[PDB]
């Protein structure tokens, strides 16, 4: 299906089934989306929710986070795992306070320059909180795109990653980007699951190659070895 149809079908689906109840999806700000993306990186959403709230209550602004002792930040992080994220989070907060006057940057270069923030995360922060025209490519998106467009290579390979980034850019619209990007992550997390995807509940089922061939297990490709 055309890229235009892809985004339209995804947005229509999101309007009907979209659930934006999470704390970081309400009254969004770059700071809140950033904080949530880092916590959600390697931790289940159910587990994250209470921590997000505790962090927002203790650190209303990025400057409050920056000024706090690293040890307190690490203590509040206890239970989320992968503490390297917490250390980069604090450094990023300090960078924002030092280089951007306490105002979380709203430009791609400046956001991506932050420790612990990559290309996809920077795009998610700006698109979700400000509606900036940037695509994302997390585990969820890679799976949906790989299956819909039959990209069987291992994303760990540069050429395959570039291919997926191009597909994401191609289907990602400017109008409604905030809803489209959140929709794609929701689709990849709740519908197009790693195992036995629920294609009958997927807005892309009519044009998805994996669905047509019942070959979802082939996309994305797994690390060769
Ligand atoms: S139709 Fe099935 S395999 Fe294709 S994207 Fe939707 S859930 Fe994933």
The structure tokens listed for 18 are: 């979209």
The structure tokens listed for 35 are: 């904080």
CA 186 → CA 75, 113, 180, 214, distances in Å?
30, 27, 10, 21
Contacts of 46 (CB under 8 A, 6+ apart): none
Residue 192 DSSP symbol: S
Cis peptide, bond prior to residue 188, ω within 30 of zero: no
- Domains, the chain, ordered by start: 1-20+133-225 (1.10.1670.10), 21-132 (1.10.340.30)
Ligand 1 pocket, 204 CB below 6 A? yes
* Residue 205 CA to ligand 1 centre (angstroms): 6
Distance CA 4, CA 91 (A): 40
Long-range CB contacts (< 8 A, 24+ apart) of 95-100? Answer: 96/62, 96/63, 96/66, 97/62, 97/63, 97/66, 97/67, 98/66
State which approach was used to obtain the coordinates.
X-ray
Taking CA atoms only, the protein residue closest to ligand 1 atom 8 is 192
* Residue 199 CA to ligand 1 centre (angstroms): 5
Cite the annotated binding site for [4Fe-4S] cluster by residue number. 192, 199, 202, 208
Task: Give the residue from 202, 93, 73 showing the smallest Cα distance to 148.
Answer: 202
| Helices and strands counted in the chain (H then E) | 12, 0
The structure tokens listed for 162 are: 């570039």
82 φ/ψ angles, rounded to the nearest 5 degrees: 45, 65
Taking CA atoms only, the protein residue closest to ligand 1 atom 2 is 199
Task: Give the residue from 104, 100, 220 showing the smallest Cα distance to 160.
Answer: 220
Ligand 1 pocket, 137 CB below 6 A? no
CA 97 → CA 68, 106, 134, distances in Å?
12, 14, 25
* Residue 23 CA to ligand 1 centre (angstroms): 28
User: Ligand 1: which of 197, 206, 212, 217 to mutate, judged by most atoms within 8 Å of the beta carbon?
Assistant: 197
Q: Locate the DSSP E strands across 24-158.
A: none
134 CB-side CA count, 13 A: 23
Residue 176 DSSP symbol: T
Decide: 23 and 41 in contact? Cβ < 8 Å: no
Torsion of CA 158, 160, 163, 164, to 10 degrees: -110
At 202 the three-state DSSP class reads: coil
Contacts of 211 (CB under 8 A, 6+ apart): 147, 197, 199, 202, 204, 205
Decide: 126 and 192 in contact? Cβ < 8 Å: no
At 174 the three-state DSSP class reads: coil
Task: Give the residue from 30, 26, 43 showing the smallest Cα distance to 93.
Answer: 30
Decide: 18 and 183 in contact? Cβ < 8 Å: yes
Q: What is the CA radius of gyration of the chain?
A: 18
């Amino acid at each position: 299906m055309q890229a235009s149809q892809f985004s339209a079908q995804v947005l229509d689906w999101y309007d009907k089934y979209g659930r934006a109840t999470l704390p970081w999806q309400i009254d969004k700000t770059p700071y809140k989306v950033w904080l949530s993306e880092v916590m959600l990186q390697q931790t289940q959403v159910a587990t994250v929710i209470p921590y997000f709230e505790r962090f927002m209550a203790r650190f209303p602004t990025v400057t409050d986070l920056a000024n706090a002792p690293l040890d307190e930040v690490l203590h509040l992080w206890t239970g989320l795992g992968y503490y390297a994220r917490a250390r980069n989070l604090h450094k990023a907060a300090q960078q924002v306070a030092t280089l951007h006057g306490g105002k979380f940057p709203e430009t791609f270069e400046e956001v991506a320059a932050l420790p612990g923030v990559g290309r996809s995360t920077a795009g998610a922060i700006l698109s979700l909180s400000l509606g900036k025209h940037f695509p994302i490519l997390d585990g969820n998106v890679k799976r949906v795109l790989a299956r819909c467009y039959a990209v069987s290579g291992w994303p760990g390979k540069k050429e395959v990653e570039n291919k997926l980034w191009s597909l994401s850019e191609q289907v990602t619209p400017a109008v409604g980007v905030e809803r489209f990007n959140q929709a794609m992550m929701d689709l990849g997390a709740m519908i197009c699951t790693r195992s036995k995807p629920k294609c009958s509940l997927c807005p892309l089922q009519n044009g998805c190659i994996a669905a047509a061939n019942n070959s979802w297990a082939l996309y994305p490709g797994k690390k060769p070895k």
